[PDB]
Amino acid sequence: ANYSTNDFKPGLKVMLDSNPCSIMENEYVKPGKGQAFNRVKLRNLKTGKVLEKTFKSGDTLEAADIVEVEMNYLYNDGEMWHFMDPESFEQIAADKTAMGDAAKWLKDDSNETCTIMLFNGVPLNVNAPNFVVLKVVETDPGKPAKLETGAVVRVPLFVQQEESVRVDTRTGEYLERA
């Protein structure tokens, strides 16, 4: 940190063209003859895009200050989502962009444990738990259903308002009755 091609490993957090990246794939190439080099697959952490780059040995990459933390959700005010560390009791706030898709899965007062990716101490991405239990607020007698967070999902015809369902947040899909 600085890192050289020798350091490259899967999941390594590096800066590339002024963007924090995570190394997905690293492959060693020993040419005959000549300097060995690395072909690396990188995920851009701000964009989610995947990059393919070749690094000659002797190439250098600055480390990116990327850390992932588990934190409990407290509340949001429509613009900032607030989390507390259950051991440290330090608080951090994430904005709408950092929350992304996770905001629609977090119930008021749920206290869900979330995974927060921090870039230079600032939340960059947030992930909700894989599965959450949310109440159906709007649905008529599958069929569309509006959950209490405003998220919309398809539920079986038998589900009724004020009933609760378990949802897979990765796919945004109903899983089962709650």
Nearer to Cl ion, 46 or 154 (CB): 154
Select the span of 82-90, 107-115, 129-137, 169-177 touching Cl ion (CB under 5 A): 169-177
Contact 39, 96 (CB under 8 A): no
105 near Cl ion, judged by CB under 5 A: no
**CB of residue 154 to Cl ion, shortest distance in Å:** 5
User: For residue 127, with 0-12 CB atoms within 10 Å meaning exposed, 13-18 middle and 19 or more buried, which class applies?
Assistant: middle
HSE, CB side, 13 Å, CA atoms: give it for residue 108.
Answer: 7
Name the residue with the smallest CB distance to Cl ion.
Answer: 142
Measure the CA–CA gap between 94 and 84, rounded to whole angstroms. 11
Nearer to Cl ion, 86 or 156 (CB): 156
Nearer to Cl ion, 51 or 137 (CB): 137
**CB of residue 101 to Cl ion, shortest distance in Å:** 19
Burial 20-41, CB ≥16 within 10 A → b, else e: bbbbeebeeeeeeeeeebbebb
142 near Cl ion, judged by CB under 5 A: yes
Residue 70: what residue type? E
174 near Cl ion, judged by CB under 5 A: yes
Number of residues that bind Cl ion (CB under 5 A): 4
Q: Which of residues 48-77 bind Cl ion (CB under 5 A)?
A: none
8 near Cl ion, judged by CB under 5 A: no
144 near Cl ion, judged by CB under 5 A: no
Residue 135: what residue type? K
Residue corresponding to tokens 């738990």: 129
Nearer to Cl ion, 68 or 173 (CB): 173
Measure the CA–CA gap between 15 and 35, rounded to whole angstroms. 23
User: What residues line the site for Cl ion (CB under 5 A)?
Assistant: 142, 154, 156, 174
